[PDB]
Assembly symmetry: C3
Homo-oligomer: 337 residues x 3
């Protein structure tokens, strides 16, 4: 332990431990499985692994509930940098391994999300739980890509959850700089595993993809994230037509050319639990965003399947559904059928 020269080199996840499972890949503007069928990610976020462990809720039964009773085919894991450091990489990766085995057994997929909020080029963030560096972010993806080489269960590497400069208080937002840094991460990933799908985000908290109309990331096999929460678009008159136009302008257009995953979406009533901008809505957003995504073939993972973090999909750890939880549960179950 004091003999640092005898610390072992890292090992890769044992692919023989898994049951057969299709790889998902990008083909044009769609995801497809390795049988050639169009595939749509449909599922939920759960909380950070460390948060779940802290209350003894990191267990296979959580994934079983979701796969069997909520219609999901995907779970997004929002890996918070502060938690990565607190558990440490070795321990955190040991718990991701569990998630891989649990998901594989149920035939569902994982999105691994490096869950920071802020501006990576200046290393300034919305809150210290998101604090990271370029060096730590690169090392996270280097470790992940090596460990989960050739693992179909781990489908998407979501490089940096929510880019934002908070009105340029964190730095001067610059698309060219952000594009170049994403390309750099993708190059490190693809040097280690070409079968994984990188997921890239725009500014305004992963809401604004409009820069990619003329400056998309110059790499193959990638998809784009979107976080179309209810109050991100602000039409004077609230109806389907006006939201659809604003969504089209900022993010929806991307689905015409590339696959898109709405890796966060959801709402709570303005006087409901943990209500805050931009997630406040009277509920009309639910049918509206689902209709929009269904029309464009957009994939999604609702935020969040947790009783503490808001907007919640459940009210307690017996999985009593919240308003949005009841709504999306029915949507996902119907889509699965």
């Amino acid at each position: 332990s004091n003999d640092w020269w005898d610390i072992p080199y890292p090992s890769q996840f044992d692919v023989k431990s898994l049951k057969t499972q299709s790889f998902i890949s990008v083909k044009g503007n769609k995801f497809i499985d390795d049988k050639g069928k169009t595939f749509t990610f449909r599922g939920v976020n759960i909380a950070d692994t460390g948060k779940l462990l802290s209350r003894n809720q990191w267990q296979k039964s959580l994934f079983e509930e979701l796969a069997n009773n909520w219609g999901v085919n995907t779970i997004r894991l929002p890996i918070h940098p502060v938690s990565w450091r607190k558990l440490g990489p070795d321990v955190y990766l040991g718990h991701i391994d569990e998630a891989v085995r649990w998901a594989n057994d149920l035939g569902i997929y994982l999105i691994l999300d490096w869950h920071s909020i802020g501006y990576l080029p200046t290393e300034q963030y919305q809150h210290p739980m998101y604090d990271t560096t370029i060096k730590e972010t690169r090392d996270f993806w280097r470790r992940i890509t090596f460990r989960y080489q050739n693992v179909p269960t781990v489908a998407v590497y979501e490089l940096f959850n929510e880019p934002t400069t908070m009105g340029n208080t964190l730095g001067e937002r610059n698309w060219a700089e952000w594009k170049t840094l994403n390309e750099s991460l993708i190059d490190m990933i693809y040097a280690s595993d070409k079968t994984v799908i990188p997921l890239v985000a725009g500014f305004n908290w992963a809401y604004d993809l409009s820069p990619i109309k003329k400056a998309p990331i110059e790499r193959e096999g990638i998809a784009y994230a979107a976080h179309p929460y209810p109050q991100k678009a602000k039409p004077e008159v609230k109806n389907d037509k006006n939201f659809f136009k604003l969504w089209d302008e900022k993010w929806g257009f991307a689905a015409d050319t590339y696959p898109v995953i709405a890796t966060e979406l959801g709402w709570v009533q303005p006087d409901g639990y943990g209500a805050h901008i931009p997630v406040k809505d009277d509920g009309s957003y639910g049918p509206r965003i689902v209709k929009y995504m269904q029309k464009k073939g957009v994939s999604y993972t609702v935020w969040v399947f947790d009783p503490d973090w808001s907007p919640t999909m459940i009210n307690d750890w017996d999985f009593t559904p919240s308003e949005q939880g009841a709504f999306f549960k029915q949507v996902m179950l119907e889509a699965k059928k």
Copy 2:
């Protein structure tokens, strides 16, 4: 252990203050918000942590200075090692005290990120000054948010003393340093446009000459100068020869921009803590005062502390040193017409 419950930060309560004029930049001068030309005239005190450690961080210190030494400004040299040691939350809690004390006395603060070295390569004169670009940005992000709309906090002195120590710390490069200052100013102005950023040149904040051809391309800023006695080295020591050399390296700036000499002072060559560049027989005192008075230059003498040299006081009963007695009389006279 629940990192997700760590609170978001709060802003200083502007209602806690009595009415106080804002200071702003207009052309080559500072003005108050009544439109009258304003000159910062005061002293440095030691780092907050040093003062706390000996029970000298107290309102009575500010009272002594305002009532008995003629000051209208105190410069707080916030040393990065001390920022880390107390931690941001605690250190900011103490800056809050200084704000309330200064406001009650009608005096102003210069907040100085007190490092010595070359930020672009993150190499420094001594570990007490050790920082990074990331930490420096974060300091200014936190400060600007917390003291938004606070008139008492007048000046944000971005980086005390740039130097490469004969290029041992890096290759001095004005373009690179200019760009980094512009980056910090942008972050600050995104959060509070009413504050005055203060920018320094090389040779330990002595050499402003690069701004003749390449000034910082932002409005509402001022430039620092640290014209210690031995920075200029004329063969023949007299007013004329020092004035010429001063003019060439820093004084010329005051023709176009406001300048604050945020450090100046001397001790006898055989006096307490004597070191280059602060050694002088005393003829410097009248000389630098005459020079600044002719150019309208603002200043804060280094240092109102009995341990750090050159001292203005010999003990915590405020027994004046040689330079202390001299500047005390100058400031008292300037305060009354």
Copy 3:
């Protein structure tokens, strides 16, 4: 102890503690001593200081064995970043001081090697024992250069042991970027001590110098490293001619214009102790690499005079020679006489 303002400024090695010793310098494509005679470094690596200390093998008797019985005029010290942090700079430098005194007393020289493996520009590495940052690497060279100013015993500063991107998994290898960074380090070093010899490495684990044909480091007085282990070149037919041609193309050509030190080389049988790519050979490599270097006037330090780290030169701490150890011992003893 809590008073950070009283932490001392650093001191320099006391040159009066040394006996008279020639300085080595660069002249054209050769090293010369300060008598003007062509000089060739010929010796060995030993293990990291912390590893040796841990087993009570950091002792003058080690250097005595090598100088008196193995024909060496040089020892390379591979200072591992993790060990630098574990001992701490002050303590590690105190032990380098011992090595300086021991080497000086024996009339031999030291190569100080910042022993990392990976890609410094992205701060990604082969293993955590090598983990560093640009900031830490600069600080290492800043401290070293100041401390060993005007010390002839310390001849070479090997800036970064083994540049590699491990098939671009660590970053996109880019010569211009790496060149520029080495130039930056050299400038900081030369600002502090112009008498030292910087040693610069290429990609593919310090094997590929070919980028210097067009784009050499644009500074005077430097030498280039090479690590020509047996399996770095892979000719279909294994003989002198074919290895010489491949070696010429990738690194040997450099010796026509600049001095070269092969700061690692060696082999073990493919079924021998700690055998791994690229150090496996049947033994024919020994005479071959020696003949090649002798023809080109190339300097060298064999890896490694340690019984634990492979390929070993000794089987135990009584200095029983391994196969390669017996071979190089005879070569060095003959070259010395």
